[PDB]
Subunit: 180 residues, 3 copies
């Protein structure tokens, strides 16, 4: 261990990529929406749970703008800018496509707190449109994620539900000062 | 060898910059752009007058630098910031993306100014553009229907040759090929965005 | 100095972080609003340097109202905007603005001398909502010019820019300061 170990480790961090998965669920209590012609603006904010569905982490918040309608695909293209809030852990910001009829990949434009300085991509997977979504972030350039955010991930499916305690925001099942 | 070479190549990639030029053309076939006259300042006739807060969603076509291949589209929004009686100098703040079909997309954020070249932030990308950062130079050829961009992208692997063809010098007479306009299979990106 | 020095220097730049502080002030001469869920709020205010001796440019972008907090007597906004520093370039941000508390936004990148940057911006509210203080933590760019690194005036309601800066005197502006 020494000079070249130091430099190597620095480079390792700069290039390293970590996975982080979360569920976004519209529980229809925040008055968050749930057209066909370019122009419609859709502000939104849903709840965010961890990959294991045992912890309420926070919320999403941002806007979608309708771009185009696809007849044969039966859906619409939106361009979106929004953030994922994880309480005191910090937040992650994204920019890119949200399309009603398919999964997409968004740009991770950066983050705060433990996500400070991150960059990469977020894979958006639609389980039930539009109320149940699953995301996997691929984050480059940050330190090791805390174990509470890396619990075994429940495979996305229609049956996948947050725990009762997570839904009730029980103190054992929330992130520190979880965003609401 | 290995160790110092491996480290070097890793750093080279993190630091390396590649240029990419494309043409953005509004062919007036997408209902774009739309005016959302939210500023709502009326003039003397009974018409629209630009004011802070007017929102402009938009989506244009994207062709490669050689103008021989249809790549995809832009999609996003502009917000009116400042304006006056002069054609030149109206300022918008914009957030939008460039879609390159299966290659991925690039997102940008920054200034759009009528009749002025500007530079925007490349906030990142996906696919072959995953993890990139840098800037995009915006040049208006024919305001507001024909634009030209050169991206300076840091942090990603060598761009494929199809996206690095000899660039047609940007001028008002620069036009996509007939093949590209009609989206002929030999003149489009894989699953080009539409 | 040599090969390992060259590489180390490159890494140092890619990982290095620099602080940059500015003041944002709504002088009410740009038509920009002073503050219903979903409402959209476009805005543009003036930007001064940390020493308050130099007019740098403006902010420009939008805020979207997300929620009300009855308890805390405030609202949450999600914002996307840029800071313009004249010929120096600009910095773009994305993140939360909350009327009753400080927040941290993402620095999505920059242009000019800020090209290739990333990091975070700490938003401090001095006077609601017309006077704010920011500290940028910028990673990956070369040394900031001294004119942007003058001694920072501690933020307080009393903090005011110099009359030279207010009047955009050549001695107290960024080159081609944004307006």
């Amino acid at each position: 261990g020494g000079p070249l170990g130091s430099m190597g480790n620095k480079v390792d961090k700069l290039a390293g990529v970590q996975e982080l998965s979360v569920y976004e669920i519209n529980e229809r209590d925040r008055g968050s929406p749930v057209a066909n012609s370019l122009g419609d603006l859709v502000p939104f904010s849903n709840k965010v749970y961890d990959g294991s569905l045992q912890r309420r982490l926070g919320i999403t918040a941002g806007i979608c703008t309708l771009i185009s309608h696809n007849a044969e695909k039966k859906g619409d293209r939106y361009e979106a800018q929004y953030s994922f809030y994880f309480g005191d852990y910090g937040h992650i910001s994204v920019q890119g496509p949200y399309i009603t009829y398919e999964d997409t990949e968004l740009v991770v434009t950066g983050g705060t707190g433990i996500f400070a300085g991150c960059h990469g991509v977020a894979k958006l997977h639609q389980i039930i449109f539009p109320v149940k979504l699953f995301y996997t972030f691929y984050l480059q350039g940050i330190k090791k994620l805390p174990e509470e955010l890396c619990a075994s991930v429940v495979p996305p499916s229609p049956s996948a539900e947050p725990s009762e305690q997570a839904k009730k925001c029980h103190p054992s099942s929330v992130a520190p000062n979880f965003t609401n």
